[PDB]
């Protein structure tokens, strides 16, 4: 059987079993349609249409099942023609970034807007987590780059490019002693229980440094991996949150009070990192540059070319980067 | 767009994108085929196949939507012929079943006798194979019905009807250590070399779960698709076998000891199913019922009407299926 | 054999067979580690690690049997500290929980508040992550409890306890073609580009299952680990989000519209669990009951003494769990 | 704490609080046991025993629980020592073969047996299937070696080495008409229902070639993949079996009558085969040579270097093959 035979038997039913009438619709003759039908009835071995002399009187019970299915065939044929083009698929390559929740939320939905306009068929996948995790993803090859925020010693064995410098903040509820205060000392901060990052205190961080030169041990009551959680816990108890400054601003967090700790802890440096051996696709260079405007392709090449991260440190040394 | 064109692109895929194989198989010429494909690719304005040179390397994304509808179309045309034959000679046709070696030997002979009694003019064709091979057989047209014994995820696109639950045994020769301990733990078993199915360990079977659970790795010295192969292996060496209980008889197999493993591996479930597109002739319902007494015509038509195989399981929540 | 040696070979697997990483992380010398490890292979007569030069390529098969037991040893040693801690001062200690961003933000504040009130001397620590990352957190010993939301096969080696069932919503901008259709089939959805978790599509998820059932492949333009990041992506573009209903509120998020997907994807079960080796302290039973009311002290110890997580689900058949 | 302390507290209860008996039994001093136990008591910050003067009187409530775990801890340290050596794994490489049931079980039990002993740490994997499935297994890369029995045109583009030559028998129940017929004829056979392989009649097989050149068209009532399954069914009615003669003998199949059919159908050739790019190992060359003694290492290698499949058959022209 052929598609054409199927069209014909569905059209003959559309046009009242008026075989003459059918043919006008479809630019052919009565002994043409009539021939293809009689052929199919012979192939299948059963009559689709009961017949009084020459006139067709009605569709047979077998007839009716067959026409019903033939309508489906036709429906599915048209469906084939309707299939979307290859343009509708994100199959031109994919970018896997490992970073933090703050990196993903704040720095990045102005960059990612910009990147998806430039590359509509390139899929993007943001992994989250601790520094340990962000590092493991790149080196195990389950992510192409890390945007690293701290504990940069774990991204030894990658290539690491400076993006910007960042500073932490003491966030408290509006009710809190600290909320209306000429700044805050390290000793004042060691007084209240701390809500910080899981990896906030490790033994070697900027938080451990500050508490260790002052001889204070801090009381840690709650920790979590992402700032959102920390802020959210800071609607509960005399606890004092320490998080990145760029993870709280007064527009979107008015139940909350950002206070300076730049005196108290040293700055951290966000870097974008990847494996020596990684082919840098066009969209890889575009992402790097959007996120951090000074890392153009010429700049990224100059740095991959150097012997190690020691030298890359010597490259940027006297370059002033943004604070965020 | 011609039906012969949808047969070609489908058959190409059924033959690993090898077009010379496709031709041998369909008794037509390679140029003819490649030609039809290039015309359809042109009519639709959509590359279906990625190409290297002359070679076809893969099915493109848009390409897959096309192939999927094409298979539908083709199975509908088969449905027409099938409907014509029911109305012409109800008791005359052929039944194509894919299932395992064990089902063919231990679940079905009894049923197949009684079926052939009832339907002398219905030719029965039983493909043996792995779960994957069974799924393949229906996917590729060689099989109206599948009796799945496990790895039921491989059939999410079929209607699948529960038949019975079944449990595995440990099988050794009577001179084996484990013969006269007659109370085996997962920890005891994992010492020994294992002789099981090729698809026994797949990452997600019940054997997988039981070892993962106890944190062990199996020692696999030998596998086979077929339980009879496994058993005649076990008659030589120091392997321990893990096969369906119903595959070992105290009568037929008294050189093999059969140990209990209900308290190690969870039971599997056998199901019988078919593409939703498949016209169910009266002899089909018979067969189903003779295999699984609770799968009456009503029950089967009710099941088919539902939308998931999970909803079909909801239908049998208050009924406790046989244990084999 | 020494405890210190077992910590070394296990913390070595933990840092991906990387010995100077193991060193840095445990404030100690690298050869100290190498010499302990060679000593243990010596003492056991078994190579635990494949070697090349002075490089560690993989864990040997008999080597893995040894690590798996080591991990047990150490986690039992930590129990002895915990039994001591309990008997000395019970209301004091720490609790490490690994779960998802969505459970930390939308299921736990109110359980956490209640908990910190009762146990001000118990520091609480919430790891966020993928289902993979949660299993890992308990495996490595950085977590006492897991609160898993899907992919429960990843915790077959844990006592897992059902808490509640949850569902997915399709989320879109209030001007997307889908908002005023109120009526989405999987076919309609599959047209669109998808935004969803990094672990949305894995081959065996509930998302995978709906698509395989309908023969369709999803268009995936962006994934994130974190449901919030998905949410703010969906506030920009053309793509449709697929996330837990409970990550989207009419008042939390009025800029997003939340469409029924109950009839597309099957529900998932949230569960809470922990290594069998873990000693359960008084605040731990407490944490568990505060999260899942039906999970009482008696219930938990009953669930522990069973043998699998299916048998544990068996216990809550004659009881409908909350839906979320 | 140290394993030694845990051994000590454990061992002290075994010797019923007698430190002296302890020292004798573990070959150590009383002062050193007593010191190590105080040490653990300090570390843990709790007493594990009560004291009368200097002797030891009773165990504490916490002690009771610490000892419980201690025993467990020790028992696991034992299990490390008892781990089976690197020899008990079959991890020296594995051998995957795609062939038929017949081949597996009537040619190979004796060829495997010999291959196993020589290579006890080489795992052996026996995929079954139809000719078309056997060829895929290899080309795809789920098996190294196919032992093909017929329709050798599917294994073009693989290296195929002739092994031997085989013919078919008619097979019947002792109650069948042909059971005691002086010979049997292409016409007599055709008048009967036929029971044969699924791929028995293809359009171009030795069964087609025979029935086609006599203008007979056969009735086929049942087909299966395996000969074993073909044999079983032939306890029914009027059906005639057509299978390989090597898969039936009167001693182990006395229920059936093996009646000759060399007049009716020409012989096929069994061949063993692999992909060109396959790196042949030693246990590879061995299995080949145990299966077909003419296929020595040097012959295989000559064959693989040759130009076409053409020449390969010509290499065996003057070499008479076994007949089975
Ligand atoms: C600036 C930044 O993103 N910092 C991390 C913390 O290192 C964060 O997750 O907030
Ligand atoms: C019950 C059954 O047939 N089980 C399969 C294994 O999945 C077999 O072939 O033995
Ligand atoms: C209910 C829940 O927490 N869902 C997970 C996904 O399983 C999430 O991270 O949103
Ligand atoms: C001789 C042989 O093995 N023949 C196959 C069929 O070609 C069989 O399975 O019996």
């Amino acid at each position: 059987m052929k598609l054409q035979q199927l069209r014909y038997i569905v059209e003959v039913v559309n046009h009242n079993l008026n075989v003459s009438s059918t043919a006008e619709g479809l630019y052919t003759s009565q002994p043409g349609i009539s021939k293809q039908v009689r052929m199919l009835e012979d192939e299948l071995g059963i009559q689709i249409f009961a017949r009084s002399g020459k006139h067709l009187t009605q569709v047979t019970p077998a007839g009716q099942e067959i026409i019903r299915i033939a309508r489906e065939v036709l429906s599915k044929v048209d469906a084939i023609k309707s299939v979307a083009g290859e343009h509708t698929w994100p199959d031109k390559g994919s970018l896997y970034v490992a970073t933090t929740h703050t990196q993903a939320r704040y720095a990045l939905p102005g960059v990612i807007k910009g990147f998806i306009e430039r590359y509509p068929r390139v899929s993007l996948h943001m992994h989250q987590g601790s520094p340990t995790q962000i590092a493991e993803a790149v080196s195990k090859g389950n992510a192409d780059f890390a945007i690293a925020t701290e504990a940069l010693h774990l991204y030894d064995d990658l290539v690491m490019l400076p993006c910007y410098h960042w500073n932490r903040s003491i966030v408290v509820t509006p009710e809190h002693p600290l909320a209306t205060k000429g700044s805050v000392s390290i000793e004042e901060l060691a007084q209240y229980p701390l809500v910080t990052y899981t990896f906030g205190f490790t033994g070697r961080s900027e938080l451990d440094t500050a508490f260790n030169r002052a001889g204070l041990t801090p009381r840690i009551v709650f920790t979590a991996t992402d700032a959102d959680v920390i802020k959210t816990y800071v609607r509960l108890g005399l606890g004092v949150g320490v998080i990145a400054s760029m993870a709280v601003d007064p527009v979107s967090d008015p139940d909350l009070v950002k206070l300076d700790a730049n005196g108290i802890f040293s700055h951290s440096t966000t870097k974008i990192g990847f494996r020596r051996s990684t082919f840098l696709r066009s969209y890889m260079y575009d992402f790097i540059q959007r996120f951090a405007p000074h890392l153009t392709r010429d700049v990224v090449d100059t740095a991959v070319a150097l012997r190690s991260n020691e030298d890359i440190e010597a490259m940027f040394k006297d370059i002033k980067l943004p604070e965020k």
Side-chain angles (χ1 to χ4, degrees), chain A residues 159-175:
Chain A
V159 171
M160 296 294 277
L161 313 174
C163 298
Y164 61 75
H165 298 312
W166 66 278
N167 48 355
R168 297 153 191 90
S169 285
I170 291 153
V171 295
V172 300
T173 202
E175 286 77 344

Side-chain angles (χ1 to χ4, degrees), chain A residues 1-311:
Chain A
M1 91 181 68
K2 306 267 170 284
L3 272 184
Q4 188 193 247
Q5 295 179 285
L6 292 179
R7 265 164 230 113
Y8 278 14
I9 59 174
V10 158
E11 290 297 354
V12 172
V13 174
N14 291 338
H15 301 40
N16 246 260
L17 306 177
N18 190 357
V19 181
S20 182
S21 174
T22 300
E24 198 173 3
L26 286 179
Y27 307 109
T28 172
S29 70
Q30 162 156 343
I33 309 268
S34 215
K35 155 198 175 58
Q36 283 308 292
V37 167
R38 281 214 300 296
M39 270 168 55
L40 179 63
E41 297 185 306
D42 294 340
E43 161 172 359
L44 303 179
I46 196 163
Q47 323 292 141
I48 295 175
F49 301 102
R51 275 187 190 65
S52 204
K54 67 187 165 166
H55 328 285
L56 301 196
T57 76
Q58 61 206 280
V59 192
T60 47
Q64 262 139 38
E65 199 70 76
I66 288 161
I67 305 284
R68 174 191 65 71
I69 295 176
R71 281 174 193 290
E72 295 171 2
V73 168
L74 301 170
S75 219
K76 298 294 152 178
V77 157
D78 291 341
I80 300 183
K81 307 208 232 290
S82 290
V83 168
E86 55 80 74
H87 64 83
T88 61
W89 287 95
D91 63 2
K92 289 290 143 194
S94 44
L95 182 53
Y96 289 97
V97 178
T99 190
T100 66
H101 322 69
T102 306
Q103 284 318 286
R105 280 187 287 290
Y106 299 96
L108 274 172
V111 164
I112 296 167
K113 154 144 280 154
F115 171 96
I116 301 283
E117 280 169 305
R118 199 171 167 203
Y119 295 101
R121 294 175 57 184
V122 177
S123 71
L124 181 67
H125 315 83
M126 310 304 305
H127 292 98
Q128 260 68 70
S130 76
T132 315
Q133 282 171 340
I134 295 168
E136 275 175 41
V138 154
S139 25
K140 294 233 76 185
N142 319 312
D144 303 304
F145 321 137
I147 295 178
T149 49
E150 73 183 81
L152 306 194
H153 69 277
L154 303 155
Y155 309 74
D156 236 20
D157 302 310
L158 295 189
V159 171
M160 296 294 277
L161 313 174
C163 298
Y164 61 75
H165 298 312
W166 66 278
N167 48 355
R168 297 153 191 90
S169 285
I170 291 153
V171 295
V172 300
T173 202
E175 286 77 344
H176 199 268
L178 284 163
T180 59
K181 210 148 172 174
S183 243
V184 64
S185 83
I186 180 67
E187 292 82 29
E188 280 165 283
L189 181 48
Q191 311 226 312
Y192 312 89
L194 292 183
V195 176
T196 207
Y197 303 103
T198 301
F199 48 79
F201 297 76
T202 51
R204 62 180 302 168
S205 77
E206 298 115 320
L207 293 198
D208 295 281
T209 275
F211 279 87
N212 289 177
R213 27 175 196 57
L216 302 162
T217 44
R219 296 188 319 296
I220 317 302
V221 305
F222 184 90
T223 69
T225 307
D226 58 295
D228 214 83
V229 166
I230 291 156
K231 286 154 60 182
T232 288
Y233 170 112
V234 185
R235 304 156 178 166
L236 200 180
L238 257 139
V240 168
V242 187
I243 66 186
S245 303
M246 82 192 73
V248 52
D249 87 319
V251 169
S252 28
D253 294 296
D255 325 302
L256 229 67
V257 168
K258 182 187 183 311
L259 182 59
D260 276 19
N262 305 166
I264 305 301
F265 310 102
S266 28
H267 64 264
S268 286
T269 304
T270 292
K271 295 199 201 142
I272 190 152
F274 61 76
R275 270 182 292 187
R276 208 62 181 54
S277 58
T278 293
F279 174 44
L280 298 170
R281 284 271 199 101
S282 94
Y283 50 87
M284 293 183 190
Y285 278 104
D286 196 68
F287 194 96
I288 289 163
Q289 199 206 22
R290 284 185 136 76
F291 188 78
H294 53 108
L295 304 170
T296 59
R297 160 188 293 262
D298 300 342
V299 172
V300 177
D301 287 340
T302 304
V304 299
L306 295 163
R307 173 57 184 67
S308 80
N309 272 330
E310 325 292 300
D311 319 74

